[PDB]
């Protein structure tokens, strides 16, 4: 199940 | 509080009058909530994650209460798998990492 | 140490004796390293988050050192945009979120 919630701008 | 990381660091938030569960995420620049209605104007934006880029709606200056602490700032709404509280709001509530 | 969240929480890690920068990510269950040609047996896996899924290689019982603190466990390798330390290793070095 999805498990890597890295997030970058924009 | 002090939160260890054996399980996902989930907390209750209140936003636009409603309660939701969100993940405290030091790996996110921004706060991203699952599709929902929020009042006021928004702009289209794109953001990136592990799998690539998605389109979101950017709402500015939105009040949110996170595990009892008040924040007011930018909230992105879009097809994230889970509600995520990112650094933009983690800094408002005084969050640090410690080891 | 205490890491604040005004900036991406990038720290130095050591893997195979070699140094890399990685992001401390409380929003990741697992640890994923940018593509590198690590020796050893591996198994294919998919990891997911914002934007969908990517294909990675799963290595087991790999020693890592995170800001001088030793850890050992599962390390994924693939086309992540940045090296990410996830909870499987953050727990080993006694990392907490505090607010």
Short mmCIF file of N, CA and C in Angstrom, two decimals, chain B residues 1-9 11 23-29 32 47-54 66-67 69 79-81 84 87-88 90-99, chain C residues 1-9 11 23-29 32 47-54 66-67 69 79-81 84 87-88 90-99:
data_model
loop_
_atom_site.label_atom_id
_atom_site.label_comp_id
_atom_site.label_asym_id
_atom_site.label_seq_id
_atom_site.Cartn_x
_atom_site.Cartn_y
_atom_site.Cartn_z
N UNK B 1 3.35 17.18 22.12
CA UNK B 1 3.64 15.83 22.58
C UNK B 1 4.96 15.35 21.99
N UNK B 2 5.43 14.19 22.43
CA UNK B 2 6.55 13.49 21.79
C UNK B 2 5.97 12.28 21.07
N UNK B 3 6.29 12.15 19.79
CA UNK B 3 5.69 11.12 18.95
C UNK B 3 6.81 10.24 18.39
N UNK B 4 6.77 8.95 18.70
CA UNK B 4 7.76 8.03 18.15
C UNK B 4 7.24 7.54 16.80
N UNK B 5 8.05 6.75 16.11
CA UNK B 5 7.78 6.48 14.69
C UNK B 5 7.62 4.99 14.35
N UNK B 6 7.31 4.18 15.36
CA UNK B 6 6.94 2.78 15.12
C UNK B 6 5.70 2.61 14.28
N UNK B 7 4.77 3.54 14.41
CA UNK B 7 3.59 3.58 13.55
C UNK B 7 3.60 4.89 12.78
N UNK B 8 2.78 4.99 11.73
CA UNK B 8 2.61 6.30 11.10
C UNK B 8 2.15 7.38 12.07
N UNK B 9 2.75 8.58 11.96
CA UNK B 9 2.42 9.67 12.90
C UNK B 9 1.18 10.44 12.49
N UNK B 11 -2.46 12.24 13.22
CA UNK B 11 -3.12 13.09 14.21
C UNK B 11 -4.45 13.55 13.67
N UNK B 23 -1.26 12.92 8.32
CA UNK B 23 0.07 12.41 8.64
C UNK B 23 1.06 13.54 8.82
N UNK B 24 1.78 13.58 9.94
CA UNK B 24 2.86 14.56 10.15
C UNK B 24 4.09 14.17 9.34
N UNK B 25 4.42 14.97 8.33
CA UNK B 25 5.33 14.54 7.26
C UNK B 25 6.49 15.51 7.06
N UNK B 26 7.61 15.20 7.68
CA UNK B 26 8.81 16.01 7.51
C UNK B 26 9.41 15.96 6.11
N UNK B 27 8.93 15.03 5.29
CA UNK B 27 9.41 14.89 3.92
C UNK B 27 8.58 15.64 2.92
N UNK B 28 7.64 16.46 3.38
CA UNK B 28 6.83 17.25 2.49
C UNK B 28 7.08 18.73 2.70
N UNK B 29 7.31 19.46 1.63
CA UNK B 29 7.45 20.92 1.74
C UNK B 29 6.13 21.53 2.18
N UNK B 32 -0.90 18.87 2.02
CA UNK B 32 -1.72 18.39 0.90
C UNK B 32 -2.86 17.54 1.47
N UNK B 47 2.51 19.85 -7.93
CA UNK B 47 3.50 19.45 -6.96
C UNK B 47 4.01 18.08 -7.32
N UNK B 48 5.18 17.72 -6.81
CA UNK B 48 5.82 16.43 -7.13
C UNK B 48 5.87 15.53 -5.92
N UNK B 49 5.88 14.23 -6.14
CA UNK B 49 6.12 13.28 -5.07
C UNK B 49 6.98 12.16 -5.58
N UNK B 50 6.91 11.03 -4.89
CA UNK B 50 7.77 9.90 -5.18
C UNK B 50 7.47 9.37 -6.57
N UNK B 51 6.22 9.42 -7.00
CA UNK B 51 5.79 8.77 -8.24
C UNK B 51 5.71 9.70 -9.44
N UNK B 52 5.86 11.01 -9.21
CA UNK B 52 5.75 12.04 -10.24
C UNK B 52 4.90 13.22 -9.76
N UNK B 53 4.34 13.97 -10.70
CA UNK B 53 3.67 15.22 -10.43
C UNK B 53 2.16 15.12 -10.52
N UNK B 54 1.48 15.93 -9.71
CA UNK B 54 0.02 15.98 -9.75
C UNK B 54 -0.44 17.43 -9.73
N UNK B 66 -4.13 21.53 14.37
CA UNK B 66 -3.39 20.29 14.23
C UNK B 66 -3.03 19.76 15.59
N UNK B 67 -3.65 18.66 16.01
CA UNK B 67 -3.40 18.08 17.31
C UNK B 67 -3.47 19.16 18.38
N UNK B 69 -3.07 22.45 18.11
CA UNK B 69 -2.28 23.66 17.88
C UNK B 69 -2.80 24.36 16.62
N UNK B 79 -5.33 14.91 -5.40
CA UNK B 79 -5.31 13.46 -5.32
C UNK B 79 -4.07 12.89 -4.62
N UNK B 80 -3.83 13.31 -3.39
CA UNK B 80 -2.87 12.65 -2.54
C UNK B 80 -3.52 11.39 -1.94
N UNK B 81 -2.74 10.32 -1.71
CA UNK B 81 -3.33 9.12 -1.08
C UNK B 81 -3.77 9.27 0.37
N UNK B 84 -1.75 15.01 4.31
CA UNK B 84 -0.36 15.21 4.72
C UNK B 84 -0.17 16.61 5.30
N UNK B 87 5.94 20.72 6.05
CA UNK B 87 6.76 21.60 6.84
C UNK B 87 6.20 23.01 6.98
N UNK B 88 5.50 23.49 5.96
CA UNK B 88 4.93 24.84 6.04
C UNK B 88 4.07 25.02 7.29
N UNK B 90 4.10 22.45 9.91
CA UNK B 90 4.85 21.88 11.03
C UNK B 90 5.68 22.94 11.77
N UNK B 91 6.25 23.88 11.02
CA UNK B 91 6.99 24.97 11.62
C UNK B 91 6.11 25.91 12.42
N UNK B 92 4.86 26.10 11.99
CA UNK B 92 3.96 26.97 12.73
C UNK B 92 3.61 26.42 14.10
N UNK B 93 3.58 25.10 14.25
CA UNK B 93 3.16 24.49 15.50
C UNK B 93 4.35 24.08 16.35
N UNK B 94 5.53 24.43 15.86
CA UNK B 94 6.75 24.27 16.65
C UNK B 94 7.37 22.89 16.64
N UNK B 95 7.15 22.14 15.56
CA UNK B 95 7.62 20.78 15.46
C UNK B 95 9.10 20.71 15.14
N UNK B 96 9.83 19.83 15.84
CA UNK B 96 11.20 19.48 15.48
C UNK B 96 11.38 17.96 15.46
N UNK B 97 12.46 17.51 14.82
CA UNK B 97 12.92 16.14 14.91
C UNK B 97 14.06 16.08 15.93
N UNK B 98 14.08 15.01 16.72
CA UNK B 98 15.03 14.86 17.80
C UNK B 98 15.54 13.43 17.87
N UNK B 99 16.85 13.23 18.01
CA UNK B 99 17.40 11.91 18.24
C UNK B 99 18.73 12.01 18.97
N UNK C 1 20.62 15.12 18.56
CA UNK C 1 20.55 16.45 17.97
C UNK C 1 19.11 16.83 17.72
N UNK C 2 18.90 18.12 17.50
CA UNK C 2 17.58 18.60 17.18
C UNK C 2 17.67 19.15 15.77
N UNK C 3 16.73 18.72 14.93
CA UNK C 3 16.60 19.22 13.58
C UNK C 3 15.31 20.02 13.46
N UNK C 4 15.43 21.30 13.08
CA UNK C 4 14.25 22.13 12.84
C UNK C 4 13.79 21.90 11.40
N UNK C 5 12.63 22.45 11.06
CA UNK C 5 11.99 22.07 9.82
C UNK C 5 11.80 23.29 8.93
N UNK C 6 12.55 24.36 9.19
CA UNK C 6 12.46 25.51 8.31
C UNK C 6 12.92 25.15 6.90
N UNK C 7 13.94 24.31 6.81
CA UNK C 7 14.46 23.75 5.55
C UNK C 7 14.26 22.25 5.47
N UNK C 8 14.36 21.67 4.28
CA UNK C 8 14.35 20.22 4.17
C UNK C 8 15.34 19.61 5.16
N UNK C 9 14.89 18.59 5.93
CA UNK C 9 15.81 18.01 6.94
C UNK C 9 16.76 17.00 6.30
N UNK C 11 20.42 15.38 6.04
CA UNK C 11 21.56 15.02 6.88
C UNK C 11 22.48 14.12 6.09
N UNK C 23 17.16 12.82 3.12
CA UNK C 23 16.04 13.50 3.75
C UNK C 23 15.40 12.64 4.82
N UNK C 24 15.30 13.19 6.03
CA UNK C 24 14.61 12.48 7.11
C UNK C 24 13.11 12.63 6.92
N UNK C 25 12.43 11.53 6.62
CA UNK C 25 11.06 11.60 6.18
C UNK C 25 10.12 10.77 7.05
N UNK C 26 9.46 11.43 8.00
CA UNK C 26 8.49 10.75 8.86
C UNK C 26 7.26 10.28 8.07
N UNK C 27 7.11 10.75 6.85
CA UNK C 27 6.01 10.33 5.98
C UNK C 27 6.38 9.17 5.05
N UNK C 28 7.54 8.55 5.28
CA UNK C 28 7.91 7.36 4.53
C UNK C 28 7.96 6.15 5.45
N UNK C 29 7.33 5.05 5.06
CA UNK C 29 7.41 3.82 5.86
C UNK C 29 8.81 3.21 5.73
N UNK C 32 14.51 4.79 0.90
CA UNK C 32 14.77 4.62 -0.54
C UNK C 32 15.92 5.52 -0.97
N UNK C 47 6.93 1.00 -4.82
CA UNK C 47 6.58 1.91 -3.73
C UNK C 47 5.78 3.05 -4.30
N UNK C 48 4.86 3.55 -3.48
CA UNK C 48 3.91 4.50 -3.96
C UNK C 48 3.76 5.70 -3.07
N UNK C 49 3.28 6.78 -3.66
CA UNK C 49 2.91 7.96 -2.89
C UNK C 49 2.29 8.97 -3.83
N UNK C 50 2.55 10.25 -3.62
CA UNK C 50 2.03 11.25 -4.53
C UNK C 50 2.58 11.04 -5.93
N UNK C 51 1.67 10.93 -6.89
CA UNK C 51 2.08 10.82 -8.28
C UNK C 51 2.09 9.38 -8.76
N UNK C 52 1.89 8.43 -7.87
CA UNK C 52 1.85 7.04 -8.29
C UNK C 52 3.00 6.22 -7.74
N UNK C 53 3.40 5.21 -8.51
CA UNK C 53 4.35 4.22 -7.99
C UNK C 53 5.63 4.25 -8.82
N UNK C 54 6.71 3.80 -8.20
CA UNK C 54 7.97 3.53 -8.90
C UNK C 54 8.49 2.13 -8.54
N UNK C 66 23.38 7.20 10.12
CA UNK C 66 22.59 8.40 9.93
C UNK C 66 23.07 9.43 10.95
N UNK C 67 23.71 10.49 10.47
CA UNK C 67 24.27 11.50 11.37
C UNK C 67 25.08 10.85 12.48
N UNK C 69 24.75 7.91 13.80
CA UNK C 69 24.02 6.87 14.54
C UNK C 69 23.87 5.65 13.66
N UNK C 79 14.72 5.06 -8.80
CA UNK C 79 14.69 6.41 -9.32
C UNK C 79 13.79 7.34 -8.48
N UNK C 80 14.07 7.37 -7.19
CA UNK C 80 13.64 8.47 -6.34
C UNK C 80 14.40 9.76 -6.70
N UNK C 81 13.74 10.91 -6.55
CA UNK C 81 14.42 12.18 -6.78
C UNK C 81 15.45 12.57 -5.72
N UNK C 84 15.98 9.13 0.70
CA UNK C 84 14.95 9.28 1.75
C UNK C 84 15.18 8.25 2.84
N UNK C 87 10.79 5.50 8.24
CA UNK C 87 10.61 5.14 9.64
C UNK C 87 11.32 3.86 10.04
N UNK C 88 11.51 2.93 9.10
CA UNK C 88 12.18 1.67 9.45
C UNK C 88 13.58 1.88 10.00
N UNK C 90 14.55 5.40 11.01
CA UNK C 90 14.40 6.47 12.00
C UNK C 90 14.12 5.90 13.39
N UNK C 91 13.37 4.81 13.48
CA UNK C 91 13.09 4.18 14.76
C UNK C 91 14.33 3.60 15.43
N UNK C 92 15.28 3.13 14.63
CA UNK C 92 16.52 2.55 15.13
C UNK C 92 17.46 3.55 15.78
N UNK C 93 17.37 4.80 15.35
CA UNK C 93 18.23 5.85 15.87
C UNK C 93 17.48 6.70 16.89
N UNK C 94 16.28 6.25 17.27
CA UNK C 94 15.49 6.84 18.36
C UNK C 94 14.93 8.20 18.02
N UNK C 95 14.55 8.39 16.76
CA UNK C 95 14.02 9.67 16.28
C UNK C 95 12.59 9.89 16.74
N UNK C 96 12.30 11.09 17.23
CA UNK C 96 10.93 11.46 17.58
C UNK C 96 10.59 12.79 16.98
N UNK C 97 9.29 13.03 16.83
CA UNK C 97 8.75 14.36 16.52
C UNK C 97 8.30 14.97 17.83
N UNK C 98 8.64 16.23 18.02
CA UNK C 98 8.31 16.90 19.27
C UNK C 98 7.65 18.23 18.94
N UNK C 99 6.50 18.50 19.56
CA UNK C 99 5.94 19.84 19.56
C UNK C 99 5.16 20.15 20.84
#
